[PDB]
Point group: C2
């Protein structure tokens, strides 16, 4: 099933995952971290690693969590095998390069956070109340049939805050409740060229 | 065989290559440039494109020439299908992200130029005298069996200048003459952990 360690590993410390959702916190690591198969999750406290100093998500859909002031994980060959970029943590903030990720997530944050170079058919899922305006800017917004999939996904009432979607024509919102007891989510949308808004889900908005 | 256009295209202007080595100069392009098959070459005058605003090298081994103050082409999804990164031009200079390229080239430059995040088995070929110290820093220099392949390749005597290869243990230099008439190349190497230097080729060093 996997193992999760809530404490940030030593910069000197090697970690090896297996099948199943393993989950750790890394700092400026000096060692070659492997995550194995299954849907894994590494949270980084610093954007670039050290010495050398790598982390491979391995097979499966793996989440990389940026607890940092900006990221560009696609550029760094130190990170590989990740599919989802989540911006969440007490230091999580600022401009984040979405390039090369197939999904996006957002949690509690230190301040306003921006996703750049977001490819087509890439959706954002918000999982907890962030701080400050969340801007999404697509790889190419210029067309007139631009579709974005926003998801809100929580057990309790979620105050998603402001998300800005400049140049998107159809905005799809899923409001998702993870438990059996009903709630109502809240969102400021700023989508000045949206012609359609479609809401799906099983919670209020 | 291909076509080559030495003038920089209009930012509004669409270009389509075929098979064979086509070759152009781009600025902050607004359009979707395709290069087709064969070994193509785009020179860019500005690091990020515009509007949107893309250039795909297509099939084959294609060169991207950075006539700019720094690059990170791997990060930008606007560029794709390139295999070789060359730093050459009257504005070419500064820090350049080698990530995702399988070969490197260097020509005449505006000033000191640095290749970062250079993967293993990636070699540099210098084609003309650059300006200022050329630093190569590898993706991972930390091991004790590090091999780098430097090539010097010119018709006439080539003053390669200073190249710095911190953390490389075996430095291989090819000194290559492209014509039948003999010459002697010059190089300052700064390789403070090299145990071996091997020189091959058909010109003097
Ligand atoms: Ca695993
Ligand atoms: Ca995995
Ligand atoms: Ca994977
Ligand atoms: Ca990556
Ligand atoms: Ca609920
Ligand atoms: Ca649009
Ligand atoms: Ca819009
Ligand atoms: Ca071509
Ligand atoms: Ca090509
Ligand atoms: Ca590329
Ligand atoms: Ca190609
Ligand atoms: Ca000669
Ligand atoms: Ca070394
Ligand atoms: Ca050395």
């Amino acid at each position: 099933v996997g193992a999760t360690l809530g404490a940030e590993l030593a910069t000197g410390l090697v970690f090896t995952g297996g099948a199943g959702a393993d989950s750790i916190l890394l700092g400026a690591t000096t060692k070659a971290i492997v995550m194995g198969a299954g849907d894994d999750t590494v949270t980084v406290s610093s954007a670039t690693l050290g010495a050398g100093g790598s982390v491979n998500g391995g097979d499966g859909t793996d989440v990389l969590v940026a607890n940092v002031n900006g990221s560009s994980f696609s550029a760094d060959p130190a990170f590989g095998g990740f599919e989802t970029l989540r911006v969440a943590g007490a230091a999580a903030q600022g401009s984040h390069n979405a390039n090369g990720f197939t999904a996006l997530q957002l949690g509690a944050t230190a301040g306003a956070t921006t996703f750049t170079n977001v490819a087509v058919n890439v959706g954002l899922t918000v999982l907890a109340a962030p701080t400050g305006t969340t801007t999404v800017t697509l790889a190419n917004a210029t067309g007139t049939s631009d579709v974005f999939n926003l998801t809100l996904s929580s057990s309790a009432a979620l105050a998603a805050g402001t998300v800005a979607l400049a140049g998107v024509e159809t905005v799809n919102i899923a409001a998702t409740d993870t438990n059996t007891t009903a709630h109502v989510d809240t969102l400021t949308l700023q989508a000045t060229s949206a012609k359609s808004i479609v809401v799906t889900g099983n919670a209020g908005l």
